[PDB]
Amino acid sequence: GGVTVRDVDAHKFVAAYAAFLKRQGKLPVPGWVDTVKTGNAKELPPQDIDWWYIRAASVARHVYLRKTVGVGRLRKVHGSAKNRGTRPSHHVDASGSVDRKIMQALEKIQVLEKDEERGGRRITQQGQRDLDRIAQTVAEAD
Amino acid sequence: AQHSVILDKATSDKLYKDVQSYRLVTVATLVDRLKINGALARKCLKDLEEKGLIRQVVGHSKMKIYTRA
Amino acid sequence: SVQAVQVFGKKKNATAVARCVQGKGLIKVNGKPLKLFAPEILRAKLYEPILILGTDKFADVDIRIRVAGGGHTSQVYAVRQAIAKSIVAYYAKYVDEHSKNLLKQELIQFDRSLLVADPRRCEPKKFGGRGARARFQK
Amino acid sequence: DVLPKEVLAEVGSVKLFNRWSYDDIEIRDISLTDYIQIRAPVYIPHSAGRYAVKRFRKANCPIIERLTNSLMMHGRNNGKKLMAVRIVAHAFEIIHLMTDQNPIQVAVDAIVNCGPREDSTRIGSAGTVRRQAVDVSPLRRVNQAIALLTTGAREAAFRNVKTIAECLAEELINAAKGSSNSYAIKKKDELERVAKSNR
Amino acid sequence: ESVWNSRPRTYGKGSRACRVCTHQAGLIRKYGLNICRQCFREKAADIGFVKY
Amino acid sequence: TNFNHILRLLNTNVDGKQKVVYALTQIKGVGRRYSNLVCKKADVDLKKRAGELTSEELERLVTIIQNPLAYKIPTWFLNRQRDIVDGKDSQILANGVDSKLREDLERLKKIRAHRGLRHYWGLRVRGQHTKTTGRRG
Amino acid sequence: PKVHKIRITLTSRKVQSLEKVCQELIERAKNKDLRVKGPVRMPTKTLKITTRKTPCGEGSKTWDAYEMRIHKRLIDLTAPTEIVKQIIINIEAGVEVEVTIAA
RNA sequence: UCGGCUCAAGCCGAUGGAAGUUUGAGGCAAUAACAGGUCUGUGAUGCCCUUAGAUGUUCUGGGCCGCACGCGCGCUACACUGACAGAGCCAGCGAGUACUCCCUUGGCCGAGAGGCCCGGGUAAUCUUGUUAAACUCUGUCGUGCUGGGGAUAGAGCAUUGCAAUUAUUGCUCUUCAACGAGGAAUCCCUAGUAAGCGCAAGUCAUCAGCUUGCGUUGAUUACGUCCCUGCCCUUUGUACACACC
C-alpha cells in the first residue's frame, strides 16, 4: 500500500519519533537545558526531561510542511499570551536562542539544509527518508 | 479537611476487599470516602488498573472514570 | 474525456473550494486524511453526509478540497456544505438522475442547510456591538 | 476504510446516536408532547439552527442542544460548546452506568417530573400583591425546568471537591423519581406551596 | 548674542503647526495633511472628502 | 515508617505532605524558579513528597542555598549585588532578607535623600496618584 | 521598429472617465493590428479617516467617518516605443497617465 | 406566482430565489427656538486694558502627577465550568522609505530585554499565508484564601530621546497585601445579538488600562402592554402666560 507523513496522527507520531531518536542518542547540547525560559510569555520550565528533543523534533515537523521558514517564523509560531499583571494580555514571542540553536544543531544530523539561494532552511533528500521510514514503522504498528 | 498523601496497610486493606462492589470509582470518590489526597487517588487508579480487575470506559487527560469488569 | 466537476462552498469568512474527479473511492481533506482535519469531538460532524447515503454510492468518486479563512467550525461547516453540492453536481451532470433525485430529497429532508447557505454577518456601530456607554444618573 | 470501524457497526442498522438508541420512548403522560422534539434524531447536539427568528421555532428543536446552551452561564462560560458537548455526553455516560435504562430514558422522566404546574403572578395593589396564582404553560414549564437543573449543578459544584462531570449527572438520576432532596424540587415545592397559600 | 533661539525644534510638538492658521494642539499629520481639524472641516469638501 | 509531617530548615517549619520543589518555597527569601533549579540540580525525583527523602541528601541542598555560585549557576539569577562601594554576588535567605531590609533605610536616611525622606514620613515613595489610592491613613 | 512591451498606469478619483478612456483606447489600438491584452481589474483602494464632528467638545460625544475610493485599472500592450505616443492622445481632465517602457 | 382575510386601503405564510421584517444596517433629514457651549481653532469680530519696569516674543528651572476624604467611566480578580507544562492549529479591516532612514525578510551573537551583517518593498509583487487570541489533545496540581489573585518594594541588565530623579518603558531574581459573587441604590440589551477573546488605525522618538473600526467562538426568555418614568392626537377645566420649580 505505502504510507507517508499525512497518514499518521501528528501528536502520537511526534512521541514515536522522539522514542526513535532516543535510540540514536546523538544530538549536541550546549548545556542550555534546565536554565532557559523557553519564552518571555511563559513562566515555568517544562517538567518532562526530553523537552529539548520533542521540541527539536517538532521544529523538524513544521519545516517538513513549509517550503521556506526562518528563525523569526519559529519565533512567533511558539509564542503565546503573557500575564502582564493588571493590564490586559497581549501576544509576545518566545525565546530566540533556544529555537535558533535547536534547529542549528539539526543541520549536522543530515535532516535539513540551507536555502541560501532565497533564504531560510529547507528539507533535504536523504533527510526526508528518515521520517518516511518511520512513517511505515508507525502506520502498520496499529 | 487535610487528607493523607501516603497509603498504609490501614488504607490498603479496604481497597482489595471493597473495589469489587463499587459501580464507579473516581478521584472524587476516593478523596470523598477514602479520606486520601487527590494525587494519591490518581496513583491508586493507575497502579490498580494494570493488575486486571477494572476496565476502561472513557479516557481523558483531565478526568478519568472506571467501573467493574 | 475525463469526468470532473468543480464546486465551491462559503461561510461567514470560510471558503472551501472542491474538485470532484472520477476516481476509485478516495477521500482526502486539505492534504490531511479525514481522520485528522477536525476537532476531536466534531469529527462526527463530517461523516453524516456519507453515512446517511451509504458507502456503496462512493465507488468511483474522488474529491480534493482546499479551505481557508474563518475558524474551525466555519471550516467544518464549509466542507460539510461543499460535499453535498459536489456529489449532486457530479451525479446530475454525468449519470441518470434516478439516484440524484432520491439523494437530494432524502438529504434535504434530513437537513435543508446542505443546499443553501446561512447569511449572518456583523453590524458596525459607533459604541461597540449594540450597547452604549454607562450613563451617570439616567 | 473511509469509515471508522466503530461507526461501521451502527451504519448497517438505522441511523441513531452511536452510543445509544432513540427507540422505546416513554409512555407516561400527555400534554407535554408536541413541544419536545424527537422525531428527527441528531448525532451531536451542536448545530447552527435558525430557531431564534419567530415565536415557536424553538418548539421544533432537539432537546440536547437546548440543555447544552442552558448549561453554560455566569460570564466565564460563553461560547464554549466544545467543552459543553463533551461534558453533557460524559454526564449521559455516567448516568448510564447507575441504571441500565437509556440515558435519554431517564432524562425525559427527569424533565417531565420537575416542572411546576402553578405560579404566582404580580398584580399591583399600591404596595400590596394581588397574587392570582395562575397556571404555567408546558413550554415555560420545560424552559424553567432546564434552568433549575443547570443552576442546581452549578451551585452544587461551586466550591466543592466534586467536579461538574458527575455533579451534573447526579441530579438526573436524583430527579428521575420523587427523591425530594434535589435543588429543583426545593424550588418546585415552594412555588406550588406559595401559590396554594396565595389562592 | 545670537543664541536667543538656541533651542532646537525637530522633536515632537513645537516643530510642527497647522498650515492655515498656526496651532499645535491636536494636529493630524497622518497622510500628510498637517492641518487643524477645525480648519479641516470647512475646506474638506473641495479637497475631496465626502460621506457615503 | 520515617514519614515525619514536619521539617525544620533555617529557623522555619515546612510541611512534608506536599511536593519537594514547593517545599523549599515555603521559607522566606526563595521563589519557584530558584527552587526549581536547586531541586533539579540536586538529582531528586520530583514525583515524591518532601517527607519521603532521606537525611544525607537534605544538607547538600541547603549548602547550595548558602553558597550558590560554586555550582555553576549564573550571576544574574542571584538576589544581591553591590553590598558596599565594591560588591560581590550573594543569595540571601529568610532571616537575611528581613535583616537586610531595615538597614538600607536608615543608611540612605543618613545620606538624607528625597526617597529616604518619603520612606521616613511613611508616605508613598514612588511617585504615584492619590485621589483614589491608599485610603487607609 | 523594435517592440518594447509597453505598459501604462492610470489613477483617478472619479470612475466613469477611466472606463471610457480604456474603451476608446482598445478600439484605437485593435484596428492597427496590434496584439492587445485585456483590461485587468485591479482592486479598489478604500481609505478612511475618523475625527470628531463637533469643534468644541460640549454635549454628547459623536463621531463621523470620511472615506475615499481609488481605482487603478492597469493595461499593457506589445508595441514599439514611438507608436504609443500617437495612441495615447486626446485625454481629458482629471485622469493622469504614467508611461513605463518596461524594456 | 400562490394560500387563508377585506369592495377598497392593508397585514401574515409558502414555493423559484439568499432574502422579501421596508432583505439588514447607515448617510442626509421640517417651522419656530435655548440668554446651551466656544473670543483658549482661525490674519472671523465690537468695546475696554497693558503697549519697552511689556499681558508681545524668547531662554533656564519647577508645576499642571502635589494628599486625613466623598463621587464617575474602565482593567485584572475572588478559582476545579480552575491553574500549570508539552503538543495540535484557524481570521479580517488596515499601515510602510526622507533631503533622512519608515514598516522590516534572511544570517550570526545574545538567558531575556537587545546587538551586528546582506537583502526586499514608494507597495494584490516585499513585510504578510500578518499560520493572533480563543480553542483542541496529552500530563502535573487537588478546595487549603494553596501552584487562584499580583498590590507594594530591593538589586541587576537594555533600547528611545538634548535631558529618564517624583524611576518613560522593557527584561532577570526576590518581596506574595486586600479579595469567597458584594448593602440601600443603579446602567445596557431582541440573532452572528449579549457576554468571552484578540487584531488594525489615531494621539506617538518610547509608553493603552483610551477612542474609532476589524475579525474568531456565539447563548436563556418575550414577539406583549401603558403599571413607574416619558412621547403623540382629540374632548374637557383653570384665578396659570417668567406658563405647577
Ligand SMILES: [Mg+2]
Ligand atoms: Mg463599532
Ligand SMILES: [Mg+2]
Ligand atoms: Mg426635525
Ligand SMILES: [Mg+2]
Ligand atoms: Mg502670555
Ligand SMILES: [Mg+2]
Ligand atoms: Mg501565596
Ligand SMILES: [Mg+2]
Ligand atoms: Mg498605539
Ligand SMILES: [Mg+2]
Ligand atoms: Mg371645575
Ligand SMILES: [Zn+2]
Ligand atoms: Zn489652522
